[PDB]
DNA sequence: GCGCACCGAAAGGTGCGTATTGTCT
């Protein structure tokens, strides 16, 4: 699966906390991408310092603060978060058993998407009057593995943070003009499914694909899925308390499912966790082989 | 966005809207 959330000044504190979910989590969880990153001399694990300050628009070498042209009556934007997530059998299978070379699987999987989204990388160039719209080949991208759902269910999921700025083909940093990165969303989503499925089928899975086009190992059938997924079982639970059909139901209606349904969750023992989610897959009887 | 009005300083740049699957920031 593959949403993208346009990220604003309100956002900055919960773009900033993509290390939060990820100090506990038992496997290079930060990770810098883009033609861009390695432009500006990022490599490797996400500064978080530095991020902030990317967040903010400051590249910081000599040059002044991205985006003062940004309205005031309107929303600065600090980026666009692609946020890749795996079937449940996929993060079943890698955090449950422990397969590690699925959770790099994912990984490549992302990877390989996000350049396909950097290939579609664009910003404008005005010059006397006239606007043009430039395809740059670059961004800058902080990558942040995550394993666990709200409800701490096993969830394999990478917030892949595309921060605001490209670098024009005049040396000159911009505003990403993000409408082929976001109007893509979806054939993005199928590029990480590709990907996924390929490197799944080399470690020697078996994939059995669904009506969506999505899949799942073949080995984990769909109620094994639904006890490791609490969250999709409230959303239920909240659109059959509104008698709503999930066939039909407007965005409203879908956001408030989805985010009025949470619950109030404290953080826990790691270690603890685990032993929790194989007892949990014993009783549901999955074989992981 | 379907070229615009309002940003700061460049006869220039920005958000705006864009999206829509499930495993469910
Ligand atoms: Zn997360």
């Not at 990984?107 to 006397?128: G, M, P, S």
């Not at 669904?210 to 799942?216: E, Y």
Request: proline share 1%.
């Amino acid at each position: 699966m593959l949403s993208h959330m346009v990220l604003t000044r309100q956002d900055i504190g919960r773009a900033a906390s993509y290390y939060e979910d990820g100090a506990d989590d038992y496997y290079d969880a930060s990770e810098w991408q883009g033609k861009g990153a390695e432009e500006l001399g990022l490599s490797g694990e996400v500064d978080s310092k530095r991020f902030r300050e990317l967040l903010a628009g400051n590249i910081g070498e000599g040059h002044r603060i991205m985006r003062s042209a940004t309205r005031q009556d309107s929303k600065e934007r600090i980026g666009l978060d692609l946020t890749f997530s795996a079937p449940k059998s996929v993060s079943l299978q890698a955090l449950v058993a422990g397969d590690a070379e699925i959770i790099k699987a994912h990984d490549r999987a992302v990877a390989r998407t996000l350049e396909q989204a950097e290939a579609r990388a664009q910003a404008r160039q005005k010059i006397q009057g006239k606007t043009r719209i430039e395809t740059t080949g670059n961004l800058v991208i902080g990558k942040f593995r995550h394993e666990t759902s709200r409800e701490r269910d096993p969830q394999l999921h990478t917030h892949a943070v595309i921060l605001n700025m490209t670098k024009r083909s005049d040396g000159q940093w911009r505003a990403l003009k993000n409408d082929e990165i976001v109007k893509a969303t979806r054939y993005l989503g199928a590029v990480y499914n590709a990907e996924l499925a390929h490197e799944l089928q080399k470690l020697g899975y078996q994939l059995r694909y669904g009506k969506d086009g999505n899949f799942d190992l073949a080995h984990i059938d769909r109620q094994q899925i639904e006890g490791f997924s609490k969250r999709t079982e409230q959303i239920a639970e909240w659109y059959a308390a509104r008698g709503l059909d999930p066939n039909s139901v407007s965005l409203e209606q879908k956001q408030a499912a989805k985010v009025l349904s949470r619950a109030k969750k404290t953080s826990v023992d790691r270690e603890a966790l685990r032993a929790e989610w194989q007892a949990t897959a014993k009783e549901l009887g999955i074989d992981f082989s």
